[PDB]
Amino acid sequence: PPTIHRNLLSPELVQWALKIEKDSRLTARGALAVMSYAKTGRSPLDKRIVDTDDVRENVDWGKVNMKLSEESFARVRKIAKEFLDTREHLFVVDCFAGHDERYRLKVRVFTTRPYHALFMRDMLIVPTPEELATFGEPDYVIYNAGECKADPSIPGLTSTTCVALNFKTREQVILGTEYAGEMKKGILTVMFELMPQMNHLCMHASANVGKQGDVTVFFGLSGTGKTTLSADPHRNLIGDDEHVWTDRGVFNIEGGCYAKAIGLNPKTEKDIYDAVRFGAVAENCVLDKRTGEIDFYDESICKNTRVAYPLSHIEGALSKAIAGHPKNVIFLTNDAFGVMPPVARLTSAQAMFWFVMGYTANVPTARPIFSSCFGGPFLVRHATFYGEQLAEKMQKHNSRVWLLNTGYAGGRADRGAKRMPLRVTRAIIDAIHDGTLDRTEYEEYPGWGLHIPKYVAKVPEHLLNPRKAWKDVRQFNETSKELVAMFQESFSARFAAKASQEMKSAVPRYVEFA
Template identity: 50%
Template sequence: RVVKDDTTKDELWWGKGSPNIEMDEQTFMVNRERAVDYLNSLDKVFVNDQFLNWDPEHRIKVRIVSARAYHSLFMHNMCIRATPEELENFGTPDFTIYNAGQFPCNRYTHYMTSSTSIDLNLARREMVILGTQYAGEMKKGLFSVMHYLMPKRQILSLHSGSNMGKDGDVALFFGLSGTGKTTLSTDHNRYLIGDDEHCWSENGVSNIEGGCYAKCIDLSKEKEPDIYHAIKFGAVLENVVFDEHTREVDFSDKSVTENTRAA
């Protein structure tokens, strides 16, 4: 849900067919307080200070506060990692996520229809996650923020894969999730720029992220060697089925969902 205020009511698409479901400031603050109170009650929380966009002129500072190490590791893999020097001078983030994970929202709160809610307040530059442990909400939430911020700078934000030839020619690959953007981007004869989210500015095409979020249904060493070999200690696998004793993953098993992922 997105807070509809005096600014966003004119800048965003609302109504029939729009993915933007409205909420008011008051409801956002109720959910924000609920998430922050829960995070404050924990013995340990995980905080990531990272960047979006490899173009230094247009990069965004993000802070992710998570209840689970799993979510922190996911974003550690997906966002651009700051150097120790950059962390020292990180300062105030441009955008903050409060991820309470499985802790639910109150479904009797105005605008709520279930115990899960992902709320975006563009004026406050904040996002609140309640009642879901799906890590992809953070990735897609920040991508939505980039779709809002970048066009204001005359920059086109793109849901695409991208790579570059030896002569500097850049290719962009558009398609729905699971249609081959990651596979095409990792062509051995070209330099990988990124597999999913990009900005096209006067400086050229830049990757928004620092990692790949690959679909891994039916993944094999023969079909997609780069993705297969990238899955090692530190990678995050979602929705996959594995042997509890050997911990070997069966990438062909779609009993949970076909949307199996590796970050």
């Protein structure tokens, strides 16, 4: 029978990783460096939601949410359980998803790899000794048999990889993938269905709070600014990736951060760099033979290197990650075309439109994409469901909505354009937080109809209006026309049929610059 290790301490898990994970080792600072092998990212094509009666009607079935019969799920679960039950060592992690006790979920994770256990210990909330002793029945159970292949001949499967979520039995089965993110995003997906049931708004956004208690959330796909922008010298971090907006305010779903490790350095990201020490995990990163230090710029393994660390590793981060109702709501658009404004103040109507449209770009040359609510791969309900929730929330709490371009400026990424200066974006955020941006004068950005500021402290005027940043006005009109067309097609395919009056009027139009 397997030797079962229940809720081991971080140092104990590190010890186990070093012993049974062939390629795992310690960095000069004590972080646990490991590799996930074959899969170094999510496998959306292999994600499934079991087709159970309790949720079938609410699940937005399509490219992201794909059905799996209960019979097939039973088959993959059996494969996963038999694999787990036949390992020499089994690791169990009991934790909570959510910092607000009134809404948190009890989760139990079974892993075969010690680093996956450490990851979950770091990424979710660790229960107290008393809570563990009285944990009872978990709400959700994750069977991470990722080191084991699935049977691709099972009806519904398309490969040896399978990440299936059953809302009826409250179970996640992972096969054929050791990428730790699959567990974390599986929990996010669970939250994207349970919160709607409780009428709360799950958000694929980071968040922080100012000294005066003003909360700001930043929506966006991974690698588009959530982690770096929420890390503010003058603001306490609440979380860098996933939050829920309730009647009481917001709460971080996680107990840690799974940040992209690319380019981490003590100069421009001191706090995060310093967090990559003992107790933390380095996933698919390469270490320098000489010093045993991680080469954060080395992507020879993959372009999705990661580090995972508890929230406690970030100075200023809230011990209990909960805070008030968002004063400022930010949409991060990683615009590869370079036509989106550094910042635009959205009206209530535009907020709705831009939120559900989710225009941004996925990182690995940055591919443009429309991702519902800036979290398309994890949504369970239709984009409109969440859009309506946000509209109601922001209206009730008088939240200010902003659109920030974290992509390119002056041209197209595929033509060698330069990225929107991080310094400019931060300057804009400070202006949002200082209250000046909300009081300055605005001008309309033609065609798009976006309201851009005429002036912003520390920010160049030629940047505020994208048109001014482009050398060739002809190329600007051509690119703008192309993107507008993309917005129109996306909208016509996704929301037109049931769109409201305000929505249709928010669809951008092409206005050639005379």
